[PDB]
């Protein structure tokens, strides 16, 4: 018929503020005609941009994560986005897994200041220390429960009360990762600690007002 480029036109996906790359990506959409306009279905699209790629221009090991972005406005070719999750993939976990060891996973839900309701998932793995001579060096149920109990407290407590883009700024620079580390070290230690998934559960949609505040300026 028309065929695809003939069909689709091209649009510049743009970040929110606290994003280093801001007119960061693009996307194409079908040629608008009678009734049928391009911008809509894009709000419902979710964009993964790599967390390193967006907020770093370079070397940084957080590139293991990518952020889900759903489109909040289109203005021109360009369309100003918000945060929906920062996730990762399989590979990390598995290189990071070691078997004949031990798992602690945890999730908490906290509502942002924003009312972006987020569920946030965490992970970390045992060790034999320097020289825990012991055959495969695990941890009790008490331990695991107790660690979760500390972990969870912080994350919700700290995350509930916070601005979303800023939830992101901490999640980027992984001061939060470390923060967990702060609580975790005097206990049974493991190695690691990561934010492995973070899920947007709830969103209170737009306000140009909210948008500028989130967007900042391109």
């Amino acid at each position: 018929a028309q065929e695809a480029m003939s069909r689709k036109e091209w649009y510049d996906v743009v970040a929110p503020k606290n994003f280093e790359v801001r007119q960061f990506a693009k996307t194409i959409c079908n040629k608008t005609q009678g009734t049928k306009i391009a911008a809509d279905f894009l709000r419902g699209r979710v964009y993964e941009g790599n967390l390193a790629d967006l907020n770093k221009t370079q070397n940084e090991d957080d590139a293991y994560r990518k952020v889900k972005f759903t489109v909040q406005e289109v203005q021109g070719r360009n369309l100003l986005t918000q945060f929906h999750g920062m996730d990762m993939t399989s590979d990390r976990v598995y290189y990071l897994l070691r078997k004949w060891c031990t798992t602690i996973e945890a999730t908490v839900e906290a509502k942002t200041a924003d009312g972006y309701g987020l569920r946030l998932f965490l992970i970390a793995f045992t060790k034999k220390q320097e020289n825990q001579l012991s055959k495969n060096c695990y941890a009790k149920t008490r331990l695991v429960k107790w660690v979760r109990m500390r972990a969870t407290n912080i994350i919700r407590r700290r995350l509930a009360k916070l601005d979303i883009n800023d939830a992101v700024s901490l999640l980027t620079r992984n001061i939060l990762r470390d923060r967990l580390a702060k609580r975790c070290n005097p206990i049974i230690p493991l190695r690691d600690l990561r934010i492995r998934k973070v899920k947007v559960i709830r969103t209170p949609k737009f306000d140009a007002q909210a948008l500028i505040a989130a967007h900042g300026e391109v």
Partner: peptide
């Protein structure tokens, strides 16, 4: 492609 704990990844 760079680093993150896997400088080019691999299967499992």
């Amino acid at each position: 492609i760079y680093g993150s704990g896997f400088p080019m990844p691999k299967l499992y």
